[PDB]
Paper text:
To obtain the crystal structure of the enzyme-substrate complex, we used a catalytically inactive version of OgpA, in which the residues H205, that coordinates the Zn2+ atom, and E206, the base/acid residue of the reaction, are mutated to alanine (OgpAH205A/E206A). OgpAH205A/E206A-GD-SUB crystallized in the tetragonalI4 space group and diffracted to a maximum resolution of 2.16 Å. The O-glycopeptide 4RPYSPRPT(Gal-GalNAc)SH13 substrate was unambiguously identified in the electron density map. We assume that the full length GD is in the crystal, but no density was observed for the residues 1–3 and 14–19, probably due to conformational flexibility. Strikingly, the GD substrate is inserted as an extra parallel β-strand, relative to the other four strands of the β-sheet comprised in the catalytic domain, in a binding pocket located in the cleft between the N- and C-terminal domains of OgpA. Interestingly, we observe an extensive network of interactions, primarily mediated by hydrogen bonds, between GD’s 8PRPTS12 main chain residues and OgpA’s N315, H215, Y318, and Y236 side chain residues. OgpA mainly interacts with neighboring residues of the glycosylated threonine, suggesting that the enzyme shows a broad range specificity for the peptide backbone. In contrast, the disaccharide Gal-GalNAc is placed in a pocket decorated by four aromatic residues, Y116, F166, W199, and Y236. Finally, in the OgpAH205A/E206A-GD-SUB, Thr-S1’ subsite is wide and Thr-P1’barely interacts with OgpA. However, the Gal and GalNAc moieties of the O-glycan attached to this residue closely interacts with the enzyme’s subsites G1’ and G2’ via hydrogen bonding, hydrophobic and CH–π interactions, respectively.
Numbering used by the authors:
A (entry chain A): 26 to 381
B (entry chain C): 1 to 10
């Protein structure tokens, strides 16, 4: 096994209690893209380095998502042949959902192959008039709860990373695409760098980072990392169980005030389990989960079952917000990976402190 | 509560 150039400068990572499942999903009429074990292994191991280095940078130690390792530089990838041709699992109209329901049956019959509740599902590109090894597509490519979907094509190989070529440009688009789709699988919403992080570190991965990964600076936000800190496959505490039950948090006494360039957020919280952290999201309308690539995020540590929180936010960090209506969301993140939000709407032209 | 899938940036 040879180590590609991009993987030569790498850090050691803590061992995790649970590992991200990797599935190479084949339609009954589909052959794999040749050499995929090596090619996707290198790409997933570099991605693991990226998440771990960003986690370490934000103070959480050398923690990334776990992977089941088969042998040196090779991930233990489940090769799955499906009951139906690939036409039955397209990008549009529930292709992903159908592919997932079949894997749920696979993992219920083969429980030793399931290493966590998070799965990344990879399908070879279609080859027709619209798509092919030159312009991949046709297959699921998104987050779906704790399942996410990416694709494979012959030149999907890390040796093209950063290269000013068609393969390099193609790789950044579909590698960053995979990086962000996986992000969604790891409990992450869309977000946008602050103005100062945009200057220091570049592009948030869960914003437009799917177009920059491997070519210009790309990074994870403090809010993204606060969520990864409560993600099952980042855990180094085996006694902590994840995602069971419902998120139970009472939030009280909220106040959001505007004194100058500062936004002041404060309040109370109570929950039967530890609340690890608070993420704050600020965006323009419209607000739906796929209209929020503009949500500028902030994060603060909490760490108690019951307590108080208080944050100051600089209005000048709100890079890209241009609308008179804006919404502030407060996401409370629990020790077991569940979270819940409260939203609050404001108008710069009629700006009123929130006080309940 | 409904949970929509998260697609990438146009
Ligand atoms: C988001 O960016 C992705 C690249 O980072 C990718 O272009 C994705 O586009 C979708 O890709 C799918 C791959 O199977 C299908 O081809 C789908 O038709 C296509 O839209 C981008 N998402 C969107 C919504 O454009
Ligand atoms: Ca928005």
């Amino acid at each position: 096994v040879t180590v590609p150039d991009a993987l030569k400068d790498r850090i050691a990572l803590k061992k995790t209690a649970r590992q991200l499942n990797i599935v190479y999903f084949l339609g009954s009429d589909t052959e794999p893209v040749p050499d995929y074990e090596r090619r996707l292994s290198e790409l997933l191991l570099y991605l693991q380095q990226f998440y771990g280095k960003e986690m370490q940078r934000h103070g959480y130690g050398a923690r990334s998502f776990g992977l089941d390792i088969k042998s040196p530089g090779r991930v233990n990838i489940i090769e799955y042949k499906a009951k139906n041709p690939a036409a039955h699992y397209p990008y549009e109209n529930g292709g992903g959902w159908k592919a997932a329901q079949e894997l749920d049956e696979f993992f219920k019959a083969h429980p030793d192959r399931k290493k966590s509740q998070h799965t990344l599902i990879i399908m070879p590109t279609w080859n027709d008039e619209k798509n092919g090894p030159d312009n991949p597509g046709g297959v699921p490519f998104y987050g779906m709860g704790r399942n996410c979907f990416a694709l494979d094509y012959p030149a999907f190989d890390i040796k093209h990373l950063g290269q000013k070529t068609r393969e390099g440009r193609l790789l950044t688009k579909w590698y960053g695409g995979m990086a962000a789709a996986l992000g969604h699988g790891l409990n992450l919403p869309h977000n946008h760098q602050t103005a100062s992080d945009g200057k220091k570190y570049g592009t948030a991965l869960m914003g437009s980072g799917n177009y920059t990964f491997g070519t210009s600076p790309t990074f994870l936000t403090p809010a993204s990392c606060a969520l990864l800190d409560a993600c099952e496959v980042f855990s180094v505490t085996p006694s902590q169980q994840f995602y069971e039950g419902k998120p139970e948090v009472e939030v009280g006494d909220v106040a959001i005030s505007f004194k100058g360039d500062q936004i002041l957020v404060s309040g109370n919280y109570k929950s039967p389990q530890t609340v690890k952290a608070l993420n704050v999201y600020i965006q323009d309308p419209p607000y739906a989960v796929n209209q929020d690539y503009d949500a500028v995020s902030f994060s603060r540590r909490l760490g108690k079952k019951s307590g108080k929180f208080s944050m100051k936010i600089d209005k000048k960090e709100l890079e890209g917000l241009n609308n008179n209506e804006f919404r502030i969301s407060l996401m409370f993140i629990l020790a077991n990976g569940l979270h819940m939000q409260k939203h609050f709407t404001f108008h710069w032209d009629a700006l009123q402190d929130y006080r309940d | 509560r409904p949970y929509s899938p998260r697609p990438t940036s146009h």
